[PDB]
């Protein structure tokens, strides 16, 4: 097509109308452009707008196409008012309030359609499943005005006779019936059914949810509501052995199942054993201890490393309070036993606050506590989907405090938020805001024990850096070592007689991380990946710092109390729901890093975060 010509265009220029056309073959697209053109003019009050012809012509030798359209334009009409009548259900106030307009407003066909949809939507809340609403426009040319009449027939109230589910081969029927707001034996509400659709999507157990409202062949006023779902395969067994002569026996395994045999329970079993580290975790929860939404769950864990050992338990109870808002709280206990601790300044500052007096640069030491705690939190979640959100936001605020009788006295609070906002109507172009903040502290002269410190960097927070490397680094004291003959520039007993910096991260009691990601369509890949492959572009920032680091005593070292040392990076990432679970592939480059930082630009890990 070399040229599209619009003949008789006087209200607008050619380019203004061409700007909205999909054509720049003519097949099918032409009808879409003609409908766009009609709506474009109708939205400006051109009550008499008409398309007279649509010639399509071939150029010589079929080397091109020439497209011309003949347009007849009228004047601009004003809408004087709207009259509504017919067999109304009595809800005249809502219809009149929706219909009311400012008199003299430029006639707009779209607002008329809106009024029609708003009336049907209104009637759908009181059980009128099949109303009939038809606009009857009238044109008064003498005054360049229009008037509207609406023919409304509310119809009958409909009741739901049964609710049936199809396509659930594993999930227990009780699960599908919990996330419902339409009850059997009561009048139909269209919005209540849509809420049920959204809740089923939010469970995260299905690839898709379809709905239908089939009329009952045996009666004029009953409806059979049907949901169809397609179950997602989630939760995978992991087992493996890594035997060799360097490490001997190396065992790992676990179960990470979000829906256990389709019964509604979530279970996490994880563990591993090797010559130096031991780890085990068990986490079990029931989203519905009670039928009305009270949940229960908890976890047990054990680990050690040869140097520390720790273990503990916790139990959490929680419940919804306002549909989109829920609360959690619980109790727990942890044992922490340390040995052979390195002579670090931050660690010993803490130990001093606890009343300890370790010998200088002497690793022949130990320390252990038993700490009972209380934890709590609040969650907000109005997302439309479990894996690829398009709208809504999520806010997760959690924290914990010690209770009397514990060895430590501290508190910790974290805040994890994300917001998805669509850009285009197809929800393929979306902007994602992702943020995290946190802070902890101590009481009575003590500080938060170092094993609870925050870390940042890695695929879960700030991309492009090595995991747990963002933040203050260890500073060592210069006593004896059985390793020097494995050493460190600051650790050697003979080669170091003063303090110096190393690359060991210690974390800190406060952090902030933020990023912006743009979600884009993937037209390069087959459509069967539309619900499994997503790509994005992103820009990350973050910072971690150590509250009350004493800059007056260690003046030859950076002042770790200044939070302004913001680290920045950006890159590209791919999200894929693989047959075996979500995977995250990314590459990013830094914009700004500080002395001691360590980079890692190519990253790959599991997701299930944020």
């Amino acid at each position: 097509i070399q040229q599209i010509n619009i003949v008789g265009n006087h209200a607008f220029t050619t380019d203004e109308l061409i700007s909205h056309f999909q054509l720049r073959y003519q097949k099918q697209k032409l009808a879409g452009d003609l409908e766009t053109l009609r709506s474009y003019y109708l939205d400006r009050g051109y009550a008499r707008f008409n398309i007279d012809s649509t010639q399509v012509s071939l150029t010589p030798d079929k080397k091109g196409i020439y497209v011309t359209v003949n347009i007849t334009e009228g004047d601009q009409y004003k809408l004087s008012g709207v009259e509504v009548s017919g067999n109304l259900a009595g809800h005249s106030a809502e219809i009149e309030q929706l219909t009311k307009i400012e008199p003299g407003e430029l006639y707009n066909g779209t607002k008329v359609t809106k009024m029609e949809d708003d009336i049907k939507k209104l009637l759908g809340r009181y059980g009128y499943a099949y109303p009939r609403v038809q606009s009857m426009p009238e044109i008064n040319d003498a005054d360049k005005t229009v008037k509207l009449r609406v023919n409304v027939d509310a119809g009958n109230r409909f009741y739901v006779r049964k609710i049936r589910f199809e396509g659930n081969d594993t999930s227990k029927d009780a699960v599908l019936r919990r996330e419902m707001r339409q009850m059997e034996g009561a009048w139909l509400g269209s919005d209540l059914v849509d809420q049920g659709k959204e809740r089923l999507n939010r469970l995260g157990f299905f690839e898709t949810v379809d709905t239908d409202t089939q009329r009952v062949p045996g009666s004029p006023d009953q409806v059979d509501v049907v949901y169809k779902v397609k179950e997602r395969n989630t939760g995978c067994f992991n087992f493996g052995i890594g035997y060799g002569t360097e490490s001997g026996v190396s065992f790992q395994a676990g179960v990470q199942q979000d829906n256990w045999l389709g019964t509604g329970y979530a279970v996490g079993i994880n563990g591993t054993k090797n010559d130096y580290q031991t780890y085990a975790e068990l986490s079990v929860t029931n989203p519905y201890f009670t039928v009305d939404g009270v949940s229960l769950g908890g976890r047990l864990f054990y680990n050690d490393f040869q140097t520390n050992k720790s273990y503990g338990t916790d139990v959490t109870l929680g419940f919804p309070i306002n549909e989109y808002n829920s609360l959690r709280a619980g109790l727990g206990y942890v044992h922490n036993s340390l040995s052979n601790m390195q002579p670090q300044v931050a660690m010993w500052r803490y130990l001093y606050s606890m009343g300890e007096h370790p010998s200088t640069s002497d690793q022949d030491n130990s320390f252990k506590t038993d700490d009972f705690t209380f934890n709590y939190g609040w969650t907000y979640n109005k997302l439309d989907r479990g894996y690829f959100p398009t709208d809504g936001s999520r806010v997760n605020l959690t924290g914990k405090v010690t209770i009397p009788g514990s060895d430590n006295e501290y508190y910790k609070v974290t805040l994890d938020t994300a917001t998805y906002v669509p850009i285009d109507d197809d929800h393929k172009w979306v902007v994602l805001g992702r943020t995290r903040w946190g802070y902890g502290d101590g009481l009575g002269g003590k500080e938060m024990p170092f094993y609870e410190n925050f870390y940042a960097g890695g695929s879960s927070t700030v991309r492009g850096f090595q995991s747990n490397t963002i933040g203050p680094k260890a500073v060592y004291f210069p006593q004896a070592s059985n390793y020097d003959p494995y050493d460190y520039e600051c650790a050697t007993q003979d080669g170091a007689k003063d303090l110096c910096k190393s690359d060991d991260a210690v974390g800190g009691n406060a952090m902030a991380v933020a990023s912006l990601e743009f979600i884009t369509p993937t037209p390069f890949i087959s459509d069967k990946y539309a619900n499994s492959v997503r790509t994005s572009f992103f820009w990350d920032m973050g910072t971690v710092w150590d509250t009350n680091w004493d800059s007056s005593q260690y003046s030859g070292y950076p002042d770790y109390s200044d939070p302004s040392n913001i680290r920045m990076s950006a890159g590209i990432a791919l999200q894929w729901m693989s047959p075996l679970g979500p995977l995250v592939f990314s590459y990013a480059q830094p914009f700004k890093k500080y002395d001691g930082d360590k980079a890692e630009q190519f990253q790959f890990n599991i997701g299930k975060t944020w």
């Binding site: 067994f237 493996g240 052995i241």
Partner: peptide, 18 residues
Amino acid sequence: DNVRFGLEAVNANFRYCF
């Protein structure tokens, strides 16, 4: 399908998704 095994001293492992 939906199952993976490997053997690779050794790194034998497998995954089975529900």
